[PDB]
Amino acid sequence: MCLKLNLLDHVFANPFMNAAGVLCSTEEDLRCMTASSSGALVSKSCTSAPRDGNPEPRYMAFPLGSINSMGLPNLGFDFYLKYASDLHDYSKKPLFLSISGLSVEENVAMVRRLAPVAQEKGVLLELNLSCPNVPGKPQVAYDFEAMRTYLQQVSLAYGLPFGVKMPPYFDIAHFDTAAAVLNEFPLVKFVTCVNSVGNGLVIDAESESVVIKPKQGFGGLGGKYILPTALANVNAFYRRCPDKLVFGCGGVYSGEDAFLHILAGASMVQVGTALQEEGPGIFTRLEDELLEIMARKGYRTLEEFRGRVKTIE
Amino acid sequence: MCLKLNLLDHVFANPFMNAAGVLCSTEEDLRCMTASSSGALVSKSCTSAPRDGNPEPRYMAFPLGSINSMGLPNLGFDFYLKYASDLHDYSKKPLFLSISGLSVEENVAMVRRLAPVAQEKGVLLELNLSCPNVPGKPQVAYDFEAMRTYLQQVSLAYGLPFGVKMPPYFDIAHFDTAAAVLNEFPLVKFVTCVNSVGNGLVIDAESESVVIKPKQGFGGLGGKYILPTALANVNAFYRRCPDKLVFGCGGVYSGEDAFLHILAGASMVQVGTALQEEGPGIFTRLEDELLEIMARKGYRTLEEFRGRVKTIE
Numbered sequence: 281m282c283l284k285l286n287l288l289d290h291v292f293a294n295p296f297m298n299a300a301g302v303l304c305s306t307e308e309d310l311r312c313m314t315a316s317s318s319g320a321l322v323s324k325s326c327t328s329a330p331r332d333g334n335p336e337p338r339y340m341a342f343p344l345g346s347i348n349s350m351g352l353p354n355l356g357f358d359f360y361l362k363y364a365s366d367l368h369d370y371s372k373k374p375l376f377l378s379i380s381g382l383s384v385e386e387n388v389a390m391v392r393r394l395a396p397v398a399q400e401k402g403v404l405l406e407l408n409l410s411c412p413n414v415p416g417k418p419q420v421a422y423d424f425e426a427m428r429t430y431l432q433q434v435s436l437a438y439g440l441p442f443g444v445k446m447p448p449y450f451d452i453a454h455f456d457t458a459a460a461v462l463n464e465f466p467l468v469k470f471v472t473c474v475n476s477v478g479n480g481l482v483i484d485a486e487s488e489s490v491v492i493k494p495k496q497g498f499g500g501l502g503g504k505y506i507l508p509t510a511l512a513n514v515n516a517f518y519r520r521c522p523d524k525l526v527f528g529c530g531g532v533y534s535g536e537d538a539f540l541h542i543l544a545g546a547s548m549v550q551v552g553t554a555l556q557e558e559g560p561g562i563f564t565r566l567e568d569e570l571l572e573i574m575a576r577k578g579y580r581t582l583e584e585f586r587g588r589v590k591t592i593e
Numbered sequence: 594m595c596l597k598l599n600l601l602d603h604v605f606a607n608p609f610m611n612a613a614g615v616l617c618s619t620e621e622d623l624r625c626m627t628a629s630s631s632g633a634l635v636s637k638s639c640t641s642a643p644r645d646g647n648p649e650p651r652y653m654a655f656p657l658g659s660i661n662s663m664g665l666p667n668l669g670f671d672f673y674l675k676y677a678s679d680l681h682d683y684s685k686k687p688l689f690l691s692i693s694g695l696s697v698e699e700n701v702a703m704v705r706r707l708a709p710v711a712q713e714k715g716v717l718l719e720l721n722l723s724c725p726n727v728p729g730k731p732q733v734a735y736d737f738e739a740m741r742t743y744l745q746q747v748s749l750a751y752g753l754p755f756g757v758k759m760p761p762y763f764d765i766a767h768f769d770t771a772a773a774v775l776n777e778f779p780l781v782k783f784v785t786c787v788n789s790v791g792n793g794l795v796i797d798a799e800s801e802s803v804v805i806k807p808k809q810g811f812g813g814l815g816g817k818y819i820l821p822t823a824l825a826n827v828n829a830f831y832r833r834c835p836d837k838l839v840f841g842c843g844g845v846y847s848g849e850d851a852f853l854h855i856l857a858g859a860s861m862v863q864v865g866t867a868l869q870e871e872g873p874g875i876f877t878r879l880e881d882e883l884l885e886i887m888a889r890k891g892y893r894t895l896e897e898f899r900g901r902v903k904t905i906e
């Protein structure tokens with residue numbers, strides 16, 4: 281029985297990795313993730329310049345999941361590029377670099393400089409399309425015209441296979457349109473579904489207060505709240521993008537939750553909130569749990585069940 | 594110490610009511626809701642003609658909430674109008690009637706018939722804007738120009754105060770646009786936030802299957818999954834529509850969850866999934882739990898804390 285995967289010209293010991301933003305901002309974090317039993321790691325989505333992010337408190341977690349408005353705190357592109365070029369031990373596992381510039385030109389400039397390092401060292405690009413648009417317009421992946429412009433310009437600039445991180449959608453027409461846009465771009469080889477469920481609001485009943493400071497308490501949701509949203513998006517893009525891989529993200533706390541993501545179509549499975557709460561030990565647990573479900577069901581490999589969710593009559 | 598309140602020129606014993614669609618399809622259901630301790634009731638969203646809805650199974654519930662693709666099964670507008678005009682006992686509580694026609698013209702046709710009964714009996718209209726749209730477009734409330742058309746035509750045809758049932762939004766630009774559309778219509782006197790979180794997917798690990806038959810298992814989510822989403826939408830529209838009432842719906846299982854909805858801005862609080870699971874007895878429990886929290890806090894009225902959620906500096 282094995283968890284091994286071979287995709288995007290890389291070998292993965294298992295499908296598990298951090299979700300971008302969790303345990304991946306500093307060299308210390310990346311070294312931690314590298315030392316873990318995860319099959320891969322992704323670095324924090326970066327800008328060309330360092331950012332402090334929003335005022336604290338900006339992340340909180342609860343039994344059913346988390347809320348955050350971090351504001352993209354990050355060490356800047358040069359740091360993550362140096363980590364990829366000079367620091368990361370590729371013998372341990374593959375590395376993804378996530379970018380999230382504030383304009384199309386910022387993203388273009390990053391990927392122009394990432395390309396040679398991608399070609400030499402094999403780092404894999406994940407483009408975060410929840411980057412903000414012009415303020416007062418929706419995030420980039422909720423503006424299909426903007427999304428197309430970004431993808432055309434990044435594809436021209438980078439010239440190598442890459443992937444995209446998508447927010448969740450909630451309407452079949454949006455699944456259709458979003459996937460059609462992505463399918464215009466043959467260099468988009470993987471689609472990670474999903475980013476946080478946007479602009480939720482947690483309120484503490486004792487204090488009668490929101491729990492995070494930015495945005496009057498509004499922030500993205502992760503964790504148990506979002507698993508069925510996540511699965512839907514995984515499966516919707518799995519069905520619509522037959523020439524691409526889908527990576528699952530959202531609501532993974534156990535090997536069972538992973539197994540559902542994989543049934544839905546996921547190749548890699550990313551872990552955000554639960555990793556933030558439990559720490560990197562979670563990867564050995566998730567591996568054991570998923571192998572136990574595979575053994576009970578008689579499955580020897582992930583491909584035996586990936587995308588094999590059954591529908592009713 | 595009692596929870597009675599006045600809104601829309603009607604008196605309510607308490608802020609609680611069913612969510613449209615739950616326990617409100619048949620005459621039996623409506624008589625059961627009238628006999629309960631709820632402060633009001635809403636009828637199932639209707640079409641001009643009766644509908645069977647989708648094949649079963651089409652609803653399922655779990656510890657964290659529910660999924661449904663009911664397909665608008667209903668007894669037809671004629672039934673619900675007869676109920677409002679001849680059968681409902683207005684001495685017991687107010688009645689809301691929900692409509693969800695498949696085109697603007699169908700909605701206009703229904704509202705022109707309802708208007709005289711609204712004048713005579715005081716039934717209140719809730720217009721469900723999660724209704725289908727023209728080809729290739731998302732639901733009506735996700736197509737802001739369609740929503741504007743619907744509201745312009747219904748306002749002209751009906752001519753009396755009404756409300757609207759909204760899907761959740763996940764982007765601050767969308768909150769801004771939607772509330773701006775609603776604020777163009779002075780006859781829109783309440784906004785109900787939210788409908789189910791669209792097109793989630795629940796998968797059963799043992800069977801490796803989706804749990805509902807329609808739409809390859811995709812359906813709207815309710816219950817614990819959606820409470821922070823619901824609160825966000827309530828508060829966003831509370832802030833943006835100062836001259837309207839907001840009714841909260843989503844994730845209410847307890848008087849503490851009700852309390853959160855009211856702190857976010859809710860006037861009435863609707864109960865869907867938890868009512869479907871626990872039955873009409875839930876209303877006495879909710880009222881007792883809300884009064885208990887109020888007493889612990891020293892609040893004597895709903896108005897003392899409605900919309901008074903605190904932000905962090």
Ligand SMILES: Cc1cc2nc3c(=O)[nH]c(=O)nc-3n(C[C@H](O)[C@H](O)[C@H](O)COP(=O)(O)O)c2cc1C
Pocket residue numbers: 299300301302324325339346348350352378408445474475476501502503504506529530531532550551552553554556
């Ligand atoms: C503290 C925090 C920071 C995050 N920052 C990023 C980010 O930089 N880039 C990104 O693509 N997603 C970011 N996310 C979203 C996660 O990658 C993930 O999509 C989301 O948390 C859902 O997964 P979960 O249910 O496992 O938490 C962040 C999430 C959290 C909680």
Ligand SMILES: Cc1cc2nc3c(=O)[nH]c(=O)nc-3n(C[C@H](O)[C@H](O)[C@H](O)COP(=O)(O)O)c2cc1C
Pocket residue numbers: 612613614615637638652659661663665691721758787788789814815816817819842843844845863864865866867869
């Ligand atoms: C079985 C079922 C049927 C529903 N049908 C309708 C409907 O006819 N009209 C409507 O406005 N909402 C409908 N909804 C949505 C609910 O009114 C409510 O917005 C949603 O379930 C969220 O509330 P909850 O978390 O309390 O379930 C339905 C929900 C369920 C579970």
Ligand SMILES: O=C(O)c1[nH]c(=O)[nH]c(=O)c1CCc1ccccc1CO
Pocket residue numbers: 301325348349350351352353380381382408410411412475476500
């Ligand atoms: O850092 C964040 O707030 C964050 N949290 C998430 O749940 N997902 C994300 O993708 C982000 C980053 C979103 C982003 C990208 C580029 C600039 C600013 C921001 C913050 O809105």
Ligand SMILES: O=C(O)c1[nH]c(=O)[nH]c(=O)c1CCc1ccccc1CO
Pocket residue numbers: 614638661662663664665666693694695721723724725788789813
């Ligand atoms: O009956 C439904 O599936 C249902 N479920 C919800 O959770 N919310 C709703 O609003 C609906 C009705 C949606 C609707 C309106 C008009 C015609 C068709 C349909 C069903 O897709």
